[PDB]
Every structure is written in C-alpha cells, then in structure tokens.
Amino acid sequence: KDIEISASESKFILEALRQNYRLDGRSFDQFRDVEITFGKEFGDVSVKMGNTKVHCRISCQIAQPYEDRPFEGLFVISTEISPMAGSQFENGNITGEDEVLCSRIIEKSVRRSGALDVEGLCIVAGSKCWAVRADVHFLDCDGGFIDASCIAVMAGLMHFKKPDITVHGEQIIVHPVNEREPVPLGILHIPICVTFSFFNPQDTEENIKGETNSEISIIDATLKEELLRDGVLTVTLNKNREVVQVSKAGGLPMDALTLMKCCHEAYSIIEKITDQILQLLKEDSEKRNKYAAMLTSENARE
Amino acid sequence: RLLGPAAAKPMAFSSEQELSLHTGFIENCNGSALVEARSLGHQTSLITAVYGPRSIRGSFTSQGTISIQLKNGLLEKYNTNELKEVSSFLMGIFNSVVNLSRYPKSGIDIFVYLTYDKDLTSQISSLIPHCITSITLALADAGIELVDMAGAGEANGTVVSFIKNGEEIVGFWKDDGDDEDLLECLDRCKEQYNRYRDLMISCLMNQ
Amino acid sequence: MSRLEIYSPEGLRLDGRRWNELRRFESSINTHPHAADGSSYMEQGNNKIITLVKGPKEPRLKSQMDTSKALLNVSVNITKFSKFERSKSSHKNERRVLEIQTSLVRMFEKNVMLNIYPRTVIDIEIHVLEQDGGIMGSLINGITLALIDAGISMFDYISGISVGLYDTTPLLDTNSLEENAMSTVTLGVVGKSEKLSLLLVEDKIPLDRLENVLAIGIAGAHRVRDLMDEELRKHAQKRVS
Amino acid sequence: SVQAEIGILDHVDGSSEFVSQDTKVICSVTGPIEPKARQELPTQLALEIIVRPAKGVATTREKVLEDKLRAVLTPLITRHCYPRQLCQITCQILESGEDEAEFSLRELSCCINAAFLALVDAGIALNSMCASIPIAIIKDTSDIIVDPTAEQLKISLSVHTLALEFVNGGKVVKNVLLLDSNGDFNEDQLFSLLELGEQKCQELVTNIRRIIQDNISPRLVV
Amino acid sequence: MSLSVAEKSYLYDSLASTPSIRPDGRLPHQFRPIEIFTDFLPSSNGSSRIIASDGSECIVSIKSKVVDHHVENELLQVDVDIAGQRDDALVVETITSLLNKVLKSGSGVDSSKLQLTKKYSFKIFVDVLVISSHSHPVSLISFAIYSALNSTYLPKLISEELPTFHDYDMVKLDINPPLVFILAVVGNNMLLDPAANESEVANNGLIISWSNGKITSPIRSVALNDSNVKSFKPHLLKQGLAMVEKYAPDVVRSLEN
Amino acid sequence: PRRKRLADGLSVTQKVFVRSRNGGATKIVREHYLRSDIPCLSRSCTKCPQIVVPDAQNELPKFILSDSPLELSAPIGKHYVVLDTNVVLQAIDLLENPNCFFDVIVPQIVLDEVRNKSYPVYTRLRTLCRDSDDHKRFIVFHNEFSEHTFVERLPNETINDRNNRAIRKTCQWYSEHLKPYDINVVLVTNDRLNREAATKEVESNIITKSLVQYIELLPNADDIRDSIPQMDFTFPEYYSTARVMGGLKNGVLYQGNIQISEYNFLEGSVSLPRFSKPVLIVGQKNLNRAFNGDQVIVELLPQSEWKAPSSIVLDSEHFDVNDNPDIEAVISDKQRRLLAKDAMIAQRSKKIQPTAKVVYIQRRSWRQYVGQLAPSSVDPQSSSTQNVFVILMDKCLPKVRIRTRRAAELLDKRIVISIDSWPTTHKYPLGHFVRDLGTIESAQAETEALLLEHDVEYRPFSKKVL
RNA sequence: UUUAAAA
Ligand SMILES: [Zn+2]
Prior knowledge:
Chain F: Belongs to the RNR ribonuclease family. Chain F: Residues 388-455 form the CSD2 domain. This is part of a larger assembly, with chains A, B, C, D, E and F. By secondary structure, chain B is an alpha+beta fold. Chain B has a single domain (1-207), classed as GHMP Kinase, N-terminal domain (Ribosomal Protein S5, domain 2, 2-Layer Sandwich). Chain B has helices at residues 80-94, 128-141, 183-204, and strands at 18-23, 31-39, 42-55, 65-75, 106-119, 151-155, 158-163, 168-174. Chain B has a five-stranded mixed beta sheet with strand order 1-2-3-5-4, covered by helices on one side. In chain B, strand 4 (65-75), helix 1 (80-94) and strand 5 form a beta-alpha-beta unit. Chain B is globular. The longest helix of chain C is centred in the last third of the chain and has 34 residues, at 207-240. Chain C is an alpha+beta fold. Helix content of chain C is 28%, strand content 30%. Chain C has helices at 95-109, 135-149, 176-179, 207-240; strands at 25-29, 38-44, 48-57, 70-78, 120-130, 158-166, 169-172, 183-190, 195-201, 205-206. The termini of chain F are far apart. Chains in contact: A-C, A-D, A-F, B-E, C-E, C-F, E-F. At the A-C interface, helix 2, helix 4, strand 15 and helix 6 of A face helix 1, strand 9, strand 10 and helix 4 of C. Bound molecules: zinc ion. Zinc ion (ZN) binds at residues 39-40, 42, 45, 47-48, 177 of chain F. The structure holds one RNA strand.
C-alpha cells in the first residue's frame, strides 16, 4: 500500500545529486514551470507545474462571524486527497499528516497573513459575513503539493467574484448573478509557497556536531526526490519582501545562514510566479470582456 | 444524514401499572422482546434485541463478554452520557445472571431502543425496571442461559433489582428521592420484582 | 488587560522585562515516578506543562512496529482551563494541534536514537495546565527534559525559544499579550550550536529583519539550554549523594 | 458535440476526462491491485467507486451517485477473471454544469462516460461498451430533448439519465444498463424517450469509438 | 489490571474467610496514605492535585462564569477527561454522568451558596483530568474536588443592572462538597477503599455518596470486574452502607483539615 | 502575595485583579517584574548612570533633566515637578506652554491612567518626553517596575488610594535620591486628600503644592495665571411604537426630515408645515443619535429652552478631540471658551425660533459613507484590534467608531464604511470597514471617492448594451 | 436642499 523503492534506485539518485544532476534535468534552484488554466465559472483554476496537476474551486456563502472578531469574514479550506493522484493515498483519511500540514500552511498564508481582505468581507458586524471556501483537488501527485496548491488558491481567489449585496439598514438582499455583476474579492498581498528538500551524503551523527555543511538542497522536488528526502523546509514570500510564513520541523537540522539563503533564492522565484499570475489573469479577463473598450463609462475629457 | 440547514430553530411550546409483554417478531437477531408500561401520567415503550452469541475471532477469554447499549429513540431524547451510565449498571447486573462460563471466546451484543418514552403532566429511574425485564425476555428467546429471572422496581428514584424470589440483590440504583428511605424502598421494589417476574414467564410460555 | 506600552523608549516591556530578558525558568524532573518513566513539569513563566514519557515498551498491538527503529508518539492536550476564558471547543482533535503534535515528532525522531531501541514505541504525553504566549517553545523544552529523565539516548539538547518583532525591536520570550500585537517566531536550537530543528513563522516578517531575529533567537535558546542543564546537574548531584 | 481526452494522469493505470456542455469530470482507474481485507472477493474483482463534488466535502448526495455508477460498471467489467483483486475508480467533478442542490443527472451521465473511458485506457476486461445521456422535458412543449442545458433543467418537469450497453461495432444494444428518472411522467412518454434515447446513445458510442481509436492506435504498433 | 488465575484463587480465598485477611494487611476500615496539593493555578479560582499510594494522580480545576440562573438550569457542570481514553469512551461518560449527579446544582450542593443578584448567579465549571489510574477513580476525584472547592475563591459582589465585582477582594466559596466512597464485597465481607488487586477478584462493588454528615442520594452498586460477578444478600447492602456512617466523619476530619 | 528573586537584581511578582465587563467576572493574573536598573534620568545624578543598561539598538539611555533646574523661593529652590492623572488631563495645554513647566517627572502609574482615559492626551504627553530639549524636559520614571518604588496593595484599600500612595512613594524616592545634588521634588496635585495624607508621612517629607499654588510660586505667574484651566451623557431612549402613534395623532409629536446646518454638525433644522420657520434642534441629546437626512419624530420644547440659530463653526473633527472611540456610560479648555461664547449670543438674540428634540427614528438615511481614519486614535505600530475614529467627508455627520487591525495600514487611506448601530450607551455610532479606495489626495482615489458620495454610477456599461 | 447655456 506504499511505494517500494529499490536500493539501486535510492543509491543512484543520491549520487546523481552529488554530481549536480537531477533526473528531470532541472537545477538545484530551478522551480518547475507553472501553468494556470481558468475554468468556466469564476474561481475555477487548474494549476499544472511539471507532472503535478492540481485544481482549486472557490465558493462563498453567508455565515456568522466569530465572537472575538465580528468585523472579519471567514476563510475555510480543506484539501482531501483522493486515490486519483496515486493509490498510496487512502481515501477518507482527512487526518493525514500531508493534508494537515498543507491546509495549515495555506491557511496561515491566506487567512492569518492577511492575504484575503477579511474586513471587507464583513456585511453586518457580528451577524452576517462572507465565508470564502477553497476546495483543493489533488489530481496527479508528483511532489510540490503545497507549492501548487498555494498557487491554485491564490490564483482562484483573485479570479473569483462574490455576489453583490445591498444593505438597507438591517436587511440584506443577495443580488442574482444575472441581476448585477459580481464583485471580485480584495487581495492585499500574494503569498507564494516554495519548498526545499534536503539530503545528506554523510549520516545523522556527522550532521549534529559537524561544522562542515555538506547538505544538498533542491527547490521543488519530484515524487522520487521527495521519497528520498531527509529534511524538508517550506517558506512563503510576497513581492513586498515580506516573509509570509515559514514551516521547518524535523529532518536535517540546518543552520541559520542556509535558511536565510533559501528565502533569498525563493524570492526570485515568487517574484516571477507573481507577475505570471497577474499576466495570465489579465489575458483571461480580456477573453471574457472582448468588447470592454466600448462599454467604459468613466472616460477622460480634453 | 441531512439534518437540514443550521439556521432553523426547534419548536418551543409555551395503585395500578398496566403492562404489555411480547417477544420475537425480529429476524436479524436471535431473541428479542417488547415491554410497554402505562401508569399515571407516564408511558414507556422500548424494544430490546440480542444479537448473539457471536464467536470472536482471535479471542481466548475463559467466559463470555456482554455488551449492552441504550440508544435514544424518537421522544424524550436523553443525554448520551446518562445512557451509557445505565448501560454500565445493566452490564454489572447481567454479568451475574447470564451464564458467562458457557460461552467462551465469544461475546453477546445487546441493543435496547427506548423508542417512545412519554410523560403526561432523574426521569430515567422509572425506565430502568422496564429495561431489565425486556432484556431477560430477549436473552431467553435467543437460547442464552440465565441463572434465574431478573427484574426490578421503582420506589421514588430508588431502583433495586432482585433475584431468586427476592432472596438476594443483584443490583442497586438510586437517584434523587429522599433520606433514610431504605427498607420501605426495598420492599416496594421487592413486591414489584415479583410482579414483573411471573409476568415474564406467562408471556414466554404462550405458543 | 488594557492598552499597554509594548516597548517604551525606556526599553521596558508591559511586564517589566527588557528586550533580551527571559521569563523566570523553573523546571522540574521526575515529577511522576508512578505514571511514566520520564517526567518533566515545565514552568516557563505562567506556563505550566506536564510532560510524561512512557517507554520504550512493547506496542499495545503488533500491527505498527518498525523492526529497525522506534516509534515516537506525542500527545499534546491543551486543557479547557489553559487560559482565563474556559475553552468551549474540543481542542483535542483540532487541526492546529495535530500540526504541533507532528512537528514535535519529526523534531525529536531525528534527535532521539530510535535505532538503539528497535521494535519499540516511545509514548510522550503532554498536558498544558496554563498557557501565556510562547507555548510552542515551552513544549519543546518539556519533551527534552522528560526524555532525559526516561534515560532515552539523545544526540544533544533541544531548546525552545520564542521571539517577537515589534517594529524594529526583537523581544525574547513573548507572552500572550505580546503575541497578540506582533509577529512571533519559535525556534528549535540543538545544543550550543546554530542548527535549527524547528523554525515556525506564523506572521508576516520583513526579510531584511528575519536574519537578526534568528540570531537573537538562537542566542536566547542557548540560555534556555543552560537553565535546563543546570537543573539536571542539581538533580543528579542531590540524587547520588 | 462532446469533448474527451484519454490518458492524462501519470500515476494511475487509466485516466479520462469527459466534457459535455459545461460539465467536466476527470476519472482515474487503477487495477488490478492488491485489495484490503474487507474488500477482497474470493471469486471476482472488487470495485472501489468514489465520486467527489466540485465544491465542499463528499456529502450523502454523492453517496447515491456512487451507488448508481456502481450498478453501471459492475456488469460491464468481466470481474471473474481478476479473482482477489481491486480496482479503484475515482471520479472528480471539476464543473457541475447545473444546480447541485436541485439536480444531479448531468454529473451522473458524465461520470458514467468518464469511468468507461478510463476503464478502456487501463486495460480492464470489458464485456461491451457504454454510453449515458441526460434527458429532460420542457413543460412548455412537453417534448423529449437530450442533454438539456442548465436553464432547461429549471423548467423541466421530469429528468432522465439513460445508460445503455452496445455490442457488435457499437450497433446492437445488449441491455439497458441504467435509466434513472425523477419528476412527472407517464407510460406514453417513457417509451417516447426510450426509443429516442437509444438512437442518441448509438451515435455517442460511435463518437466514443472514434475518440478512443485516435489515441490508442498511435500508442500501439505505430 | 491483569493477573493469573493461580493467584486470583489465592486472593479470593484469603479475602472471603472469617478473618478477612487483606493483601497489604490493612483493616477493612483503614485507608492508604494520600497526598493532596491545592492552590497552584492562578488562572483558575480553585485547583487541586491528588496523588494516591498506587500511583493514581488526578488534577481538578475550577472556573466561574456569571450566568442568569432563570435561564441556566444546571449551575455545576463537571467535565471529566481521562488520559489515554477517548472523550466519547464508555468508561468516561459514566463518571461524567455520575459526578454531575453527586454535584447537582440544588441536590448535592445548594444553589443559595453561589447566588449573586436576584437574577444572576455563579456557574461552577469543574474540569477533571486523570493523569494516571489503576482502579475506579470516582472516589479519588471526590477527594480532589473536595479540597478544590474548599480552597476556591470567587470575586466579591458589589451592589436591576449588570452586576459589578471588586478588583482586589475575593470571597471564599463556602460550599459543602459531597464525598464519594467505593466499597467491594468479597463473598460475605465488606472492604472500604479496595485496591487494584482486591477489586479484580471481588464479587461486586458499592458506591456511596456522603454529604452534610449523611449518606446522600446518588449511590450505585456497579460491578468492579466482569469475571467474578455474584449477587449479594440484602444484609450485605446495609452492612457496608452503615459501615461508612461510622468512619466517614474520620475522613472529613482528616480531609477538611 | 509573594515575591521571587532572579538574577542580577531582577525580581518577579504576581499581579491579580478581577475584571468586570458585561456583568461577567474574569480573574486576570499577570507577571510583574521588579528591577533595580531604572534611572532617574537626571543629569545631576551620579549613581544611576552606573547601573544603566542599553536598549535593543545598544544605546545608553540619555539623562534629560537639567542639572540646574528652576530655582524658586525658599525652601523649594531648585526643584523637579511630578504630575498626577487629574493634572495632566486638566492642564495638558498648560504643560505645552513654553513659559511654564521645564523639568517634569511623569510617573508610570500616572501615564497608564492618562492613556487609559484619553489616548490623544497621552500622545501629546509622550511627545513632550521625545521633544525634550533646552527649554522643555519631560521624562517617564517607571515607578511600577522599580524595586524601590513599587508599592504593595493593602487590604480593603481603594484602587485610587493605592495609586495615590504610589505617587507619594515616587516623590519620596526621588527626594531621597536627589538629596546629594540639592534638588527638591514638588508634587503638583489638586487632590486635597492626597496632599493631607503626605503631610502625615513624616518618614520622608515631601513638597505638595496644588496647581494654583505652584503657578503662584513662579516668576512669570501673572503671564500664565490667566491661562490655567478651571479645576473640576446617556442619550434618551426612543419612544415606544404605541406612543409615537398617539403623539402624532393628538398633535403632541411631529414628523420631518433633519437638515443639519452647513457649518455646525450639532444644529438640526426640521421643516414643519405648522411653523413659519424651521424648528431648530440644538444639542447632542436633542438630536438623539440621528443622522442628517433621517425621517424623525420630534417633540417640541418649552419656551424656556428655545434657542437662536447658533453662530459657531463645529464639525465632527474639531469637537471632543480628547475622547476615545469606546467611550460609554476629560474636558478641553478650547471647547469651554467656545461653548461658553455662543451661549452669550443666544441670550441677547431676537431671532429666537421654536426648538424641539428627536424622540424616534422612522427612516434611516444610512448608507456607505466615504472618509478617512482619525490619526489621533491610531496606534501606528500595533497589528492588533484597536477601536479608531473615522472622519467622514460629509461635515454634517459625526465620527464613527470602527474595529480594525489594519489601522496602521489604513492610515492616509480614503476608505468606505457603513454604520451598524448607535445605542443609548455609546457616544458614537458603530461601523466597519468595507472597501479601500487608495491613498489620500490621489487623483484615482479622490475622484472615485467623489462619485461614491453622490451615488454616481461610474462602472462600465452592461454587456446587454452591446 | 444654486437660475440658465453649451459640456
Ligand atoms: Zn538617579
């Protein structure tokens, strides 16, 4: 019920890394090329980076705010992995360590870090608010699960549009989608996740009390590179030079200088992935609004 | 399981003890029963089913293992914490009546469904003597061995279960009530135990 | 409380400490010689954590058993009375708790010599009686001192320290009031080194400030190691003599 | 006109993607593989059918969706030639193409077609072929129309999801696999749509055969 | 516990004889030494930690909340959590339902001792945490909540408007906390406070509740083991029941000290 | 309580106090650290510079108080000034006077109460400490953290009496600490019972002079005595639905739309058909939580309460500036001289038209208003939930209280809010953020804010127009 | 609750 790795295959990939070689042909700091496929309705985003394929679905509904924060909206997210991405995922295991760590990283990146404008999702204080839900569907697993899922959710929230609501004192009328054009969600910053996989050609003893750092770090590992991984690190940055969130627990205990180096290497990656999502969203908007140049109302004078 | 929308609220509105005894009428389990009691402004209607004995795979116990479970029916839904409390008291009684040494490496599962508990004016004290008389009829219908019939009675919260024509007590339960009411509460249930004891035999011998 | 000064121009925080000062550290070893083989009552500030280590022993079922190493289980239970307002939720099966439980297992399964104890399981039971900011770091120091009491072979100490960044001023050992007003970073330093077995950042931090926060973080973690080490010296010397 | 692609996933034995109107369903088939204890069958092949909605978790709405899809694929697979084996068939609905709360016929029709396609790419023994179409009647004209759009369902009186079984070059109909209907209809309209549904599924398998040939043939001796 | 049938017959024959020889040699009216710690949780009003001789340790915390007693039925809710056992376990909900009856607001403890205004009153939250256990802990938790309630301090009332409380002064919780005892019958002898090995080979068990110098309502007769379950003569029911009436004042004199 | 010792002079104690809020009681326990490295911040001091510890930026604390303070007549002479909570809130403008105070010592227990009662007054007080130079010197001695001045609470002692004892102990320590340098400590407090309690403490005699007494002891007393301030709420509930029906039936009540004056947000003029002139509604209680444009039910006032059209300019921005948004059931001197100046005009005016009061709201004119955050209520370095003020663009409207954690980010941003409620206990209406329009004085952000305030539809045309 | 004209 688990992936069997032969001793010959395990030895080959490790020695290939000691010679600056990866089976897929990338570099030690080369992120996989990302592709965004927008669906029909708003909030339907399909992300394809490498052989890893993920699909996100954004929805929302009226719900009660928290008693401790009545001026903010809710953000729900659940990433249940089906046997579609691989027969090693037992269906119905929502408490899996991968599913748990994935949701908590994206939840910190979007909700806690202030990516989604929760204060703008408040309709009436302490009674009515928006509860935006992010359903992530893992289609084909080949490493970089939380890297692609974070790209899918961020591309989905920026592509989704919530229904329009007019407040008449205490009443709330949800305008049909055909009545009024839906309003897009407010996004403050764009958190992008970059994971790092670590290997040691030595052993655990030569790593605890060893000054010579012989660790090998690769950016965005594949499934075979992930199964042979020793230590794991996940950082999240934005184009504003801000560290959104960092999660490193277990594996090879690394030093502070290398972790700071991982962030500076990841910033050049998130900076390019950010401008791609901004460009691919611009191209998808012109696809739906072809004659948008004639329908402009606010026009300059002379 | 639908449960409907969470925005909906439930409705808010501002001497002689008749008895009915039955058994069988169930094909899933081996033995079942149905007791009904209507007296004063309170009615009781619960169904008991005994799914056993079932051989346990990989077990090596010297005697059987009884599993009693009370499940909320459709009216007067009690709290789940008190349902298992009475079940643990029911297991403490039937572990001395059912011949455990006869069924090694096997367990017996009991299912009592308090379907219709109604009051017309602790409320669970009045229902305990009716649950004991329903399991004994169901355990005997399943061909399981029991050392003498087991019954109980109520005497203002105090519930005492006797055996061997009331000579020896098998269980004791008391909630609310008063103080120093012991010998009178015992005799009020001792004569009530015999009222339920011979009535179970009269229903179990008919055809 | 109310609207307090987090870091005044006089360098004093809301509780009186300064930027590089720690809360009082009073650890206790072998507090449950009748409930577990390892015991540690961690009292870091207002925090009061009970950590038990039951093992290494045979697993209750032969289903899950690694014939080449040991199984490390961590059970973090946040009591309802951990804070002032009694918790109404369940806390036990919370998704935030499962992340902490897993992050602790990965952190120590690489530091604990599970190979020395094959075909065995090590159960770690944690009960938080009271919390007040920096609860993750205090969970770290409790497990370290509890395994040592159980006689489990480890490579080095694992220290838990919490650091906050208020504008342009790092703050060591953040309490609850400080975590609700700035970003928080919990570190997991190994011994007197700079090797990090844990690095949790849960709030936005500028990249130009994170390196200095990490340096001041690992520096305070070494100070946490000595306080635990000096506790074991005093406990071992009074036990032998 | 519907779109379909075969072999899109790299970590399953067979994958498929069925697109009709606005409904899109991706299926994944993996087998024969080692089953679990409660799943293994002594004589024939075991099936693990799992369908998932586009939004939210898998509620009881999709549970009846699994049980109906299970009854379509069970007689279609030669189960007896894979004793003590398992086959995972996961259907992921990307876009619903209708109203999830009020309807659930277009998703069942696409999950049946997507599952059959993924069963062909995985190389599982199939006794025949399959084709499923949604059918509803507008309350205005009261006539039978196939694959009704999302706006045509809200005005419909009764909905239908007919699944057939074709043999001999996709011509002879061996047996009617599934015909699930809900609404208001009589016996006169039942055969009025059953005869019309048999000729709309006949051109579907004829279109399916053309699709599953443009992709399998290049991978073989070519 | 888990023992061998060879030594089970030895302890059964030694506890059912007329001398009634106990394993550790203690008399049927004696107890084991108990350590109790109180007042160590500043975030809570009351607190207590109890440690038994066999290793059973239990911690109890007490919180308070102002609630309208005209809409709040029970003012004393007990939340029991046993380590290693599920919250929905059968052995956890039984004690949870049993302790809610020995400390019921109005029956076991009178609500007049925790009322404030004619509208509002204090609600007592009793959180129980069992770190370790080797026998039935319903008698150990009663000893823990007893010392916790008698060492509890609640804020003082200042006086229809919302009640206000003082900043510094806090009143003591003057409440008589009921006490729970466990009795095991071995053939024809009564044993007050059994052990892990005594309760394993016993015939039946008794649970008696003591409040205000008298045996109060919530009492049980649950079996202590599923192996040797025997029916008892009614003369044994009143023997052990009246036996606690003689030595329970000696318990309170040593516990309320 | 108890007290534990730590390293290098540190000591930790426990601070417990019950918090009453909304009828609930929550026992709050906190850690309190008592240290012995807190300096007097006096240039004359030669003992404290030896125990100072630099900050996080490794900066030694600078000593501010002048080595040659203001020398008065005997037996005061060269002295320092210690203030109280009441003295700061009362004469905050007098503190900022360049020819008045020079060397001032603000203890911690005073700064905590001033900030808890008026954050903008706390801001200008902290500003004096930061802007300390050659003509003005303000420090903050953290008396509650020093091991030499922290005073333990006594049984059944008033909370105000314990803090008063902390201020006395602070002046005792400062007097003893400065004896080698021959500098006295003057405690400026208007609390008469506080000064009488100090003269009984012969253990360490101090100087206790009130505000009017300290001013008279200065050389330029005649130039500042005229500038000293004088030494020292719930809205009426709306009528029931049955009474407003009977009032409008029998001619007791009237209905109309409020039109707030163009240059005063506290003077409403409801037009009624039974009067030749619009009925005035002057005052906070008479308007009764109503907004400009609502259909309200007014009740006439007796002729003894009739007023003239006010001739003063008042907007929500220049009124009650020393208030907190969360004020519910501190007086500025500038508002005293202005509110007492307009009362003299209505007394001699002959344009006295009938006045009324609002007793019921029938239709609300609430919507999405555009404005900006008031900086005086914003903590520009706290990412926590803080109640802030919103200055709406329509000067005929009041200030709105909103809760937000992006207050530092939303500063200098022209945002949009919507009012939720305004109960009788709250002084200001409750709103919440909904939309950010951009930076202030930005052409893109101002023109967009301009159209929203006039319901101008600037969104593109519909696709059905094609 | 700013007249008229072209915007
Ligand atoms: Zn000094």
